[PDB]
Structure formats: C-alpha cells, structure tokens
Design a protein around this nucleic acid. Structure first.
Ligand SMILES: [Mg+2]
Ligand SMILES: [Mg+2]
Ligand SMILES: [Mg+2]
Ligand SMILES: [Mg+2]
Ligand SMILES: [Mg+2]
Ligand SMILES: [Mg+2]
Ligand SMILES: [Mg+2]
Ligand SMILES: [Mg+2]
Ligand SMILES: [Mg+2]
Ligand SMILES: [Mg+2]
Ligand SMILES: [Mg+2]
Ligand SMILES: [Mg+2]
Ligand SMILES: [Mg+2]
Ligand SMILES: [Mg+2]
Ligand SMILES: [Mg+2]
Ligand SMILES: [Mg+2]
Ligand SMILES: [Mg+2]
Ligand SMILES: [Mg+2]
Ligand SMILES: [Mg+2]
Ligand SMILES: [Mg+2]
Ligand SMILES: [Mg+2]
Ligand SMILES: [Mg+2]
Ligand SMILES: [Mg+2]
Ligand SMILES: [Mg+2]
Ligand SMILES: [Mg+2]
Ligand SMILES: [Mg+2]
Ligand SMILES: [Mg+2]
Ligand SMILES: [Mg+2]
Ligand SMILES: [Mg+2]
Ligand SMILES: [Mg+2]
Ligand SMILES: [Mg+2]
Ligand SMILES: [Mg+2]
Ligand SMILES: [Mg+2]
Ligand SMILES: [Mg+2]
Ligand SMILES: [Mg+2]
Ligand SMILES: [Mg+2]
Ligand SMILES: [Mg+2]
Ligand SMILES: [Mg+2]
Ligand SMILES: [Mg+2]
Ligand SMILES: [Mg+2]
Ligand SMILES: [Mg+2]
Lengths: 62, 119, 152
RNA sequence: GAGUACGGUAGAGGGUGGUGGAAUUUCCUGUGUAGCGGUGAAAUGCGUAGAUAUAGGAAGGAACACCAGUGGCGAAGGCGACCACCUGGACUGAUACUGACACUGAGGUGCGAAAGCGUGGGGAGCAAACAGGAUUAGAUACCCUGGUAGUCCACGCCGUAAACGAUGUCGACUAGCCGUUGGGAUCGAUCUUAGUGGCGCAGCUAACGCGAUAAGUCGACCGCCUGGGGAGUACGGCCGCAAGGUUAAAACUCAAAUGAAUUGACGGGGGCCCGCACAAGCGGUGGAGCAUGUGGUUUAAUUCGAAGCAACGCGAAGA
C-alpha cells in the first residue's frame, strides 16, 4: 500500500517494492472482484469448481 | 496577476480503466495544476494506454513546476492501466518522490455492484 | 514459409567499381531482365553526380542512402475488433532495401529528360535531404511517432 | 431397542435490543479550469449558471471484505459484523434408573427460497416497466445514459421452484486405501465413535455408473407408474382479496415418443502440424481496341454436348 524511500535508494527498488506490497495486499484482485454483482449460485458453483480442482491437483502429486 | 509559492506538495493519480487524471495540490488539498489524458489529445482507446498517462502526468508536473514544489507525496487511486507510468512521468519532471501510497477504496460489504454484462 | 530453410544466395557482380551496395541497386533498378540498360542508366547518373559534385560519387551515394534509411515503421495488426497500427523498428538488413526501393520509385516519375539526370537529382537531393523520398520517410516516421501509444 | 438423571464440547440453529468500521450517494464550503463519463468504436448524459478531480463538515439507507475451509449447524426451506438477554437440538464419558414404553403412517395438522398481494413506515445502491443513445435490413433485445414498482422494516396472506443426491423413512449384515470436522481412550503412534469428501474388491445395472453416506444382501410400512400428444388442460368440489393453488377426465390424433452408449460429420470448442494460405515482394486482370468461347436475343437454320471450384482458346491437333 505505502512504500518507504530511504538511503537515497535508486528509483528502481522503489517501484519494485511498491508492486510487491500491492500484490501482497491483493488490491487488484479485490477491486476486480467487485465490478459486477456475482450471484450466490455462481458463488457456490465457482467455489465448488475451485475445490475439485484443488483436490485434483493435491492428489496428482501421488 | 496573482502569485504565490508552495513547497512539498502532493500529487494525485486517478487511474480508471477509461481514463487517468493527474492533479497537484499542497498538503491542504488546493488545486494548483491538473491534466487529463482526454485533454492530452487521445480521445479513444489510446486514452487508456499507459503512454497517455505518462504524457498527462509529465504535462501536469511541468505546469506545476512554476510554483517550485521541491517535494511530492504522490498517491494513486484506481486499478486502470498506467498505475505506475504516471509515477515515472512525474519523476522525469524533476521532483523528489517523498512517498508513494495507494488510496484505492475497498468496500467491506457496501452497496451491490451493477448487473453483469452479457457481451 | 513455415520451415525457415530458405537459403540466401549472395550476388556481388559489380563490373568495374567493385561496390556491393551498387550491385544491389543494380538488381533493384533492373527491369524485365535488362541488365545492360540498368548499367548504362546508373552509370550515367553516377557520371552526372561526379561532373556536378566535386566529392567522389561513391560517398555521395552512400550519404544519400544513409539519409533515407528509416529506423521505425508502422505495421497493421488485427486485434480482433479494431484496426490498429503498431510501430516496429526496422531489421538492420531491411532498411537498405527499403531505401533502395523508395529511391528508385521516386526517381522513376520525375518527368525530365531521362533517368540519368533523374537519379542524379534524387541522389543530390537525398545527400542532404531535400528530396521527396526523405519527406515521405519523415511522414512514415511521424506516423510511427503519432501511433506510439501502442509501441510495445 | 427406546427413554430419563449427571459433568463437559462445538456450532452463520432461532428471537428481541444496542453498538461498530469500509464504501456509495446527496447537500454545504475552499482551491482550481476545460473537460468528465462510457464503448468494439460512438453517442445520449453531465460541464464555464464553473463540472470531473481535490480538502473539510453534515444526513441517511442497505450489506457485513480479510477469517472462509470437500468448514459447521438446521426436519427441510435456510443460516456469516460485534455484544447482551430469552431459547431448541446434537455430539461426548461413567454410573444409576424405567423395563418394549418401538417403526411406519391413508386422512389431518404445522413449517416452507424467490417473485407476488394488503395496511403502515423507510428509501443510499441496484433495478422489471419506461425514456433516450447506439447496433441492425428491422432490433418492441444483447451494449450505453437515466430510471418507477420491488429489493429493507412491522403485521397478515399466498403454498409454489431443476423445493435435486432428479435417489421415502426405519433397522441388520458385507474386502480395503487416502483425507477432514467434533469427542474419547491406550502407549508423535495405535484403537474407537458421530458426521463430511476422494478411490476401489465382490455384488448389481441396458449402459453410464453405484459401491458401509449402495443404486449390494435382506426385512417393516407408506407414496407413486402403466405409449406420445390432447393435458396437469376442461368441468365439479375445496382453499385464496387477487394472482392463482390443489384434486383431476374425455373425445380426437400418431406409430412412435424415449434412455445409455458406438462410428462418422460438424462447431462463430480446444491443442499441435502442413500447403504462394496469409505476411514480405515482383508482375498482371477488371478501364481501351482486337481475337476467341459462352449466356441472351434474332433467324429457315445459328447442329449436338460440356455448367461452382471439377464449363466457358472446352469435344474441335484447323466449319
Ligand atoms: Mg458499467
Ligand atoms: Mg466533488
Ligand atoms: Mg469527503
Ligand atoms: Mg442446503
Ligand atoms: Mg420476499
Ligand atoms: Mg411484492
Ligand atoms: Mg409489501
Ligand atoms: Mg407501501
Ligand atoms: Mg435510487
Ligand atoms: Mg440498462
Ligand atoms: Mg443507473
Ligand atoms: Mg438509480
Ligand atoms: Mg403491481
Ligand atoms: Mg420484513
Ligand atoms: Mg437449496
Ligand atoms: Mg420429484
Ligand atoms: Mg424423469
Ligand atoms: Mg423424505
Ligand atoms: Mg433408506
Ligand atoms: Mg424419526
Ligand atoms: Mg435409515
Ligand atoms: Mg440403520
Ligand atoms: Mg468408487
Ligand atoms: Mg438400477
Ligand atoms: Mg436399468
Ligand atoms: Mg417384503
Ligand atoms: Mg413391507
Ligand atoms: Mg421393506
Ligand atoms: Mg395416454
Ligand atoms: Mg392415446
Ligand atoms: Mg390417451
Ligand atoms: Mg389447473
Ligand atoms: Mg371435455
Ligand atoms: Mg377448478
Ligand atoms: Mg443420445
Ligand atoms: Mg470439425
Ligand atoms: Mg500477399
Ligand atoms: Mg478488358
Ligand atoms: Mg468489360
Ligand atoms: Mg453451344
Ligand atoms: Mg486453357
């Protein structure tokens, strides 16, 4: 979210740190997940699909 | 024919998908100079590109350099492209980037968003 | 093609001047397989350049070529919903052929006595850049600059 | 078998109040000036009667990010901010107690998403109807800008859903392996319960597939089916304020309708690969005159045949 500039750091660590902090906070994900109303049927459907894919991926290692 | 000086201001980036708006104020939030990607002469899909953001941010910074402004707190708001392009555009103008923050509003539950597009 | 197996046959058949770029200009200016006519036309233009400019025509031709060689060009792309043009830098080899093609094409339509003095006028004009070929190269460049929003 | 008494465990189970933070909108005020918004690209719309952005203040309504999980609770429908009060059930351990007090259940009785209806409040966002702008041959649609009922609250009604695991309730048996939510024991390991998931032996099935959460082996009781349309419609009865719900035919008409799987074909499905198929270049046709073939028209006859690529300087390498 916020970034600190110190020790006359070059203007390359600043942007990289800002991007890393932003993706850690996941601001883009949350703002993308709210541009349209997403009904509870689609909620449960998407979560069930995510669950089945996650379990398949976990099993596939063995 | 009115003149005043200011040092260590704050610059706002409003980067939506369609357009990005750059403005400069003091710590008190009084407008000094602003520039828009629509005003930079793009008028279309190009208006969304990060290059238009760079052009608008540098134009606004060069307009605001008349007041001095040896220090800037730049804060960004919006998920559109050019989120970081305007930062480098302002750094090209010859300011001191004191800090960079995001003020993207995130409702906890809030109002419900509009209906889903069927395209 | 789809293989990338096509070879690159090398042709360097300068008769007396012994220049490589001159040979490719010969191949460009040749029409209907008339090599001798191309030889006479290019050598007449070269001799006019010599009798006009005190500088040797080799370097005059070279500096005309280097002042008409472009650096970037605009190329259309099918985005799937819009008609977009993106600027791309020239391959180092392609710019020579582009300059040769532009020079010969603009020289073909002067309207004066013959292509000897036509190519002479074009070489003198492009030596410092007052020819129509240089103007159209600048127009292509300014297309590429005005379409920089895409860039990539 | 069923139930009672006693300590604990977990939980968006239910009801009545109170209180939080993020955000949107609206209003007021300061700075500031020419755009904002939206799209595939636009336009409608909002702006110099000073907008968008930006800073401060105020009002109000609604939903409760992150935790969050093949996670939990509930008869089902369903239930996520935090706290207090009232309240149902389930798991878990030992002892004591009652001594078949059980299962199912036609009728009946209640609970029952959303939309809808009645009376009275409330109204930020969204948004049927509706207005305008686009797209289009048309566009009473998809897209854009606005926008009323409604969505929220109290009380009452309505009785329906792909109300679904498309699988009635209860009980007993039948190889195993990997998770996970509560709780116990014995020494991170082993065992044992009540749920919730993934595979799989027998067995079953038309096949798909099910497989201790059976669709296997069996018992007890209930509900329902008898070719496709007509039709879950008509008439009658009973409910409802209305919308309508429920019970429920016949004439007539057809020789089929249907389920699962197989081969091919196809797709404005996907992944690789190839070809002057594109791209990179050169040169042409379509404009002129003429030659030649064909179509049409005319003629007494313009002799027959060839007709998307795969007919048209073709049978005809000589009217
Ligand atoms: Mg929208
Ligand atoms: Mg404002
Ligand atoms: Mg405010
Ligand atoms: Mg449920
Ligand atoms: Mg309702
Ligand atoms: Mg209603
Ligand atoms: Mg009502
Ligand atoms: Mg009312
Ligand atoms: Mg409203
Ligand atoms: Mg609309
Ligand atoms: Mg609206
Ligand atoms: Mg509205
Ligand atoms: Mg009505
Ligand atoms: Mg209510
Ligand atoms: Mg349900
Ligand atoms: Mg059923
Ligand atoms: Mg059926
Ligand atoms: Mg049942
Ligand atoms: Mg059963
Ligand atoms: Mg029972
Ligand atoms: Mg049972
Ligand atoms: Mg049992
Ligand atoms: Mg199995
Ligand atoms: Mg069966
Ligand atoms: Mg069967
Ligand atoms: Mg029996
Ligand atoms: Mg029986
Ligand atoms: Mg039985
Ligand atoms: Mg029948
Ligand atoms: Mg019949
Ligand atoms: Mg019948
Ligand atoms: Mg009826
Ligand atoms: Mg009848
Ligand atoms: Mg009736
Ligand atoms: Mg079939
Ligand atoms: Mg196909
Ligand atoms: Mg091509
Ligand atoms: Mg012709
Ligand atoms: Mg013609
Ligand atoms: Mg014929
Ligand atoms: Mg031929």
């Amino acid at each position: 979210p916020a970034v600190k500039v110190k020790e006359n750091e070059p203007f390359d660590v600043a942007l990289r740190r800002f991007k890393r902090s932003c993706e850690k906070a996941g601001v883009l994900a949350e703002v993308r997940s709210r541009e349209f109303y997403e009904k509870p049927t689609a909620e449960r459907k998407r979560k069930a699909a995510a669950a089945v894919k996650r379990h398949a991926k976990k099993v596939q290692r063995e | 024919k009115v003149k005043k000086t200011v040092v260590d201001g704050i610059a706002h980036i409003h980067a939506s998908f369609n357009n990005t708006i750059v403005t400069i104020t003091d710590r008190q939030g009084n407008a000094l100079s602003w520039a828009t990607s629509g005003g930079s002469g793009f008028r279309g899909s190009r208006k969304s590109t990060p290059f238009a953001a760079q052009v608008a941010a540098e134009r606004a910074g060069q307009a605001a350099l008349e007041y001095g402004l040896k220090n800037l707190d730049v804060n960004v708001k919006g998920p559109g492209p050019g989120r970081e392009s305007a930062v480098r555009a302002l750094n090209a103008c010859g300011y001191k980037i004191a800090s960079i923050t995001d003020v993207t509003p995130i409702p906890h539950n809030g109002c419900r968003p509009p209906k889903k597009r069927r395209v | 093609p789809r293989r990338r197996v096509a070879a690159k046959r090398e042709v360097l058949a300068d008769p007396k001047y012994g220049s490589q770029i001159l040979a490719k200009f010969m191949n460009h200016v040749m029409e209907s397989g008339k090599k001798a006519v191309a030889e006479r036309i290019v050598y007449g233009a070269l001799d006019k350049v010599k009798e006009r400019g005190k500088a040797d025509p080799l370097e005059t031709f070279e500096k005309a070529l280097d002042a008409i060689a472009p650096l970037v060009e605009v190329k259309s792309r099918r985005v799937g919903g819009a008609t977009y043009q993106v600027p791309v830098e020239v391959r180092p080899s392609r710019r020579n052929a582009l300059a040769m093609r532009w020079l010969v094409d603009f020289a073909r339509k002067r309207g004066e006595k013959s292509m000897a003095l036509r190519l002479a006028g074009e070489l003198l004009d492009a030596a410092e850049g007052k020819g129509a070929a240089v103007k159209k190269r600048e127009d292509v460049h300014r297309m590429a600059e005005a379409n920089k929003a895409f860039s990539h």
